[PDB]
Amino acid sequence: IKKISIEGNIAAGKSTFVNILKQLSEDWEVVPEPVARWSNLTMEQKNGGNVLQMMYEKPERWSFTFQTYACLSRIRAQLASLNGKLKDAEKPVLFFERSVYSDRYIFASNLYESESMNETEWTIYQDWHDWMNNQFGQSLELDGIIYLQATPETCLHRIYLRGRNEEQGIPLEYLEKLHYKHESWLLHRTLKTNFDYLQEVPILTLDVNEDFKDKYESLVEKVKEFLSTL
Amino acid sequence: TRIKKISIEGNIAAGKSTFVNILKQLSEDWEVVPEPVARWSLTMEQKNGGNVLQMMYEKPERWSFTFQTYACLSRIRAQLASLNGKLKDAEKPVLFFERSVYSDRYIFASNLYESESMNETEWTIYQDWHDWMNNQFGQSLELDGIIYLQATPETCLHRIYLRGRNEEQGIPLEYLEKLHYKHESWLLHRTLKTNFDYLQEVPILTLDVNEDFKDKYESLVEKVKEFLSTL
Numbered sequence A: 001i002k003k004i005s006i007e008g009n010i011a012a013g014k015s016t017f018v019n020i021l022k023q024l025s026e027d028w029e030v031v032p033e034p035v036a037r038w039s040n041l042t043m044e045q046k047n048g049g050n051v052l053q054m055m056y057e058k059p060e061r062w063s064f065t066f067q068t069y070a071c072l073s074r075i076r077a078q079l080a081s082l083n084g085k086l087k088d089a090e091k092p093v094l095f096f097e098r099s100v101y102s103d104r105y106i107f108a109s110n111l112y113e114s115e116s117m118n119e120t121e122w123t124i125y126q127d128w129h130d131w132m133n134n135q136f137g138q139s140l141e142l143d144g145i146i147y148l149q150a151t152p153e154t155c156l157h158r159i160y161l162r163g164r165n166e167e168q169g170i171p172l173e174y175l176e177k178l179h180y181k182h183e184s185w186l187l188h189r190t191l192k193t194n195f196d197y198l199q200e201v202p203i204l205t206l207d208v209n210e211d212f213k214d215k216y217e218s219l220v221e222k223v224k225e226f227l228s229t230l
Numbered sequence B: 001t002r003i004k005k006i007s008i009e010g011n012i013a014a015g016k017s018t019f020v021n022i023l024k025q026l027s028e029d030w031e032v033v034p035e036p037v038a039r040w041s042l043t044m045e046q047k048n049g050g051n052v053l054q055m056m057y058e059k060p061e062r063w064s065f066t067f068q069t070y071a072c073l074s075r076i077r078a079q080l081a082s083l084n085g086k087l088k089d090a091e092k093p094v095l096f097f098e099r100s101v102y103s104d105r106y107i108f109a110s111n112l113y114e115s116e117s118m119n120e121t122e123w124t125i126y127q128d129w130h131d132w133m134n135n136q137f138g139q140s141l142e143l144d145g146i147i148y149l150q151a152t153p154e155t156c157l158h159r160i161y162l163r164g165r166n167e168e169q170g171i172p173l174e175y176l177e178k179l180h181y182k183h184e185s186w187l188l189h190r191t192l193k194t195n196f197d198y199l200q201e202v203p204i205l206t207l208d209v210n211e212d213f214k215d216k217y218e219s220l221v222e223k224v225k226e227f228l229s230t231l
Ligand SMILES: CCCc1sc(-c2ccc(OC)c(OCC(C)(C)O)c2)nc1CSc1cc(N)nc(N)n1
Pocket: A033, A035, A036, A039, A052, A055, A056, A057, A059, A067, A070, A071, A102, A103, A104, A107, A108, A111, A114, A115, A116
């Protein structure tokens, strides 16, 4: 199986793009993001719901707890697909809706930066993150990234389009701060991670500013070519 | 795998470190993994450890969950590493753990849940992580046996009074009964059902360590060497 993580800002179009891909090839399957599932039943998802709501109310009390549980749920859920899926397929591809690196170098790092996590919580999380991925998540190494690039302003409208109730307060500032970090890591590539192979990973950046729900062929053609390059 | 893994279990100040330390010297084939939190009680672990301990003491309701996660992680890292580091050329290698991932959760984390310093979402979340993660290690850290060092709260208090740490001097006798009770259920009556199936069939040796054993441990070790020859 090849592993491709699909990255991008909130409401840039990842769920939608990934649900277009999985429909196109028996060799293509998807791992959605747990935090995504949490946003509306097994024990993980009641913890997910409670913990999500707690995070909305008092993020500086709950950011450490949330981050450690979101990533754990992602690490476990990517494994459920990599060890039990695409058994009878010729050129398997598993497409991750975000990654263990999104968890750390976008969201957790941004919470540390808005002081939702104190120094020690952040230092426990990075050590907890290094070890949890290296003990259990080795097989998760990514063969490439797809960055669905959407201006901060495109994203603000798309949460409006998504018309979810709890997400209309999101200031362009919050959405802009995630954008800058997304730009630094994947486009300008000025971010340093603690993972050496992430320095070299193939990366495909896709301008997803124009809507693509019924005009996505050119985007899908780029993915096919990018995949061949692996 | 060929290394025997034995937990030493006991309440605070029962004398586990004293025992462990005695044991390491009685044989070149006998090795010990000190409990990471006891050390905190200077790497980045000491730094992080140092802080969350003081934060934990300062406010149990805020830091209990964070502390419990890091203590159990730092423990697993000592344990899996000693496996790799010592006893590669021993014909009769035994590794003594100062406590286990079971005491983390079944003594300490449960206690803190029962005392409302972790809410339900933190305790089930903590339990989720412990369950799944120890189940990745199919048999690796899993115990060959357990040695219960059974003392009284008073001895432990008495022994707290002797250990000479003001930072502990205020630990209340009432907390010990609670902790002591949790040990007796798990290690004496065997009524603590857990979610690690092999445990209920892990042999337990119980030693009463109320009598001062420091100059006079030979009996205690005979019972340990007797126990090891049946595992
Ligand atoms: C529903 C998505 C999860 C949430 S909720 C949230 C949030 C909610 C309320 C907040 O204050 C009122 C908030 O403020 C953050 C801040 C005040 C800047 O520290 C963040 N940020 C986030 C982004 S954190 C996140 C998201 C995600 N998908 N994965 C990971 N690992 N972390």
